[PDB]
Amino acid sequence: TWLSDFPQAWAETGGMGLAVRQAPLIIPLKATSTPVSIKQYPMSQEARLGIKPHIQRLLDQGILVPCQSPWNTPLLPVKTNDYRPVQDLREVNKRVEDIHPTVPNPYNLLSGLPPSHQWYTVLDLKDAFFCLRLHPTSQPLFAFEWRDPEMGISGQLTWTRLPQGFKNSPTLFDEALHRDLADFRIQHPDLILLQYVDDLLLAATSELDCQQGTRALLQTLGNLGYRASAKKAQICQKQVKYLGYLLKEGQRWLTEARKETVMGQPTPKTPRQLREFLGTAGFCRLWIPGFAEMAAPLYPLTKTLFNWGPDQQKAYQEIKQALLTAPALGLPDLTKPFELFVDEKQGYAKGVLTQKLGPWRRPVAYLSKKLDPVAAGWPPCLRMVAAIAVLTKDAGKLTMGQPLVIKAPHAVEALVKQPPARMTHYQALLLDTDRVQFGPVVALNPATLLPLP
């Protein structure tokens, strides 16, 4: 019934997308750039015949158009017996002006979601980038060659919409939609709307508010020319998957699918493989307690010889073990006080940001960082101070200057005041007791990192 009441909004019924409020895009190039014409890949026939209807359908939609350009890039077939066209815009991307990535990575986005809104509707937009038009100035940029030896049709085609493979399509679209939805954001103070490029989350306090909000959102998305996938929608559910995170009743999990992308990486044998392993797993560092110290043996194996010893394997094992046993994280409650439990061992700072839940403490985040070399050399009880200081600044990213209590296995509010160099900067954000308070000393659990009775 959600399908009929909004025909224009679903890609299944509402046809092709087109941001009506968006002007055609001009694509600035680098100053030293010059047209590059790459010879066409001598395509197979088995591919050229499966690719053909996709191309024809784009011509009918006017998204592809004939042209004649000094530019040209390869059109490769890809992957059942379903061949889809994919254009190698590498040499083009190199010649285009870079832009500031204003896209907030999934986590920092989800972090902006309150627990008081436990009714979710997730949507994704079908053929997002194509909804944006390409100004005739910069169309010739994405020209490619199309032939059909069964016809003798060696001509050129190019895109009238923002293409796939172009390095700036994500940011551009994100900005476009963010602009196009500001109005909807304004006219719904009771709803939270989250956005990663073409992935949308609508959070509401009640189920009613959610339903109505979703109706509004769909009507708007329709009116704007955007089109959502009805097959993959998650409408008005207490529990939803969004950007590879499971949201359910004021709580947040790593979906198993998101785990797999790290769990499924073979033991890195080259330094680059290890780099990207840590790079991928690094996104889930706020689920891994003591991650900075845990992944310590693996860091030095970068850019040197690659001695994959027992330590490296042990760490590599810990990191996956820590994902298999990754906890639930509660969405930060900015209408509550925060508690921060900090600890340090061997020049690595680890800690946990928690909040009240019933009489229990529910972890909001696990904070861990390496102490800079100068601090890493400091004596035992000073590195603690350094650790607390470092983690506090990271917690600030989540608490938003809210009231925050600190606890450590060796309380140390004193030494902050009477240091017998770098203190001028530490006393700044620590002795500011409007946001920051201390607590009694207390040792914490090596795993959970919560206090001991």
Curated annotation (Swiss-Prot):
Positions contributing to Mg(2+) 1 binding: D124, D198, D199
Manner of cofactor binding, per the entry note: Binds 2 Mn(2+)/Mg(2+) ions for ribonuclease H (RNase H) activity.
Binding site for DNA: R258, R272, R275, F283, W378, R422
Domain Reverse transcriptase, chain residue ranges per copy: 59-247
Cofactor list: Mn(2+); Mg(2+)
Binding site for RNA: Y41, D88, R90, P104, N168, P170, K369, K370, K397
Lineage: superkingdom: Viruses
Any further remark recorded for this protein: The reverse transcriptase is an error-prone enzyme that lacks a proof-reading function. High mutations rate is a direct consequence of this characteristic. RT also displays frequent template switching leading to high recombination rate. Recombination mostly occurs between homologous regions of the two copackaged RNA genomes. If these two RNA molecules derive from different viral strains, reverse transcription will give rise to highly recombinated proviral DNAs.
Subunit text: The reverse transcriptase is a monomer (Potential). Interacts (via RNase domains) with host release factor ETF1; this interaction is essential for translational readthrough of amber codon between viral gag and pol genes, as well as for viral replication.
Functional note: RT is a multifunctional enzyme that converts the viral dimeric RNA genome into dsDNA in the cytoplasm, shortly after virus entry into the cell. This enzyme displays a DNA polymerase activity that can copy either DNA or RNA templates, and a ribonuclease H (RNase H) activity that cleaves the RNA strand of RNA-DNA heteroduplexes in a partially processive 3' to 5' endonucleasic mode. Conversion of viral genomic RNA into dsDNA requires many steps. A tRNA binds to the primer-binding site (PBS) situated at the 5' end of the viral RNA.
Protein name, UniProt field: Reverse transcriptase/ribonuclease H
Region of the whole protein represented: 683 to 1146 of 1738
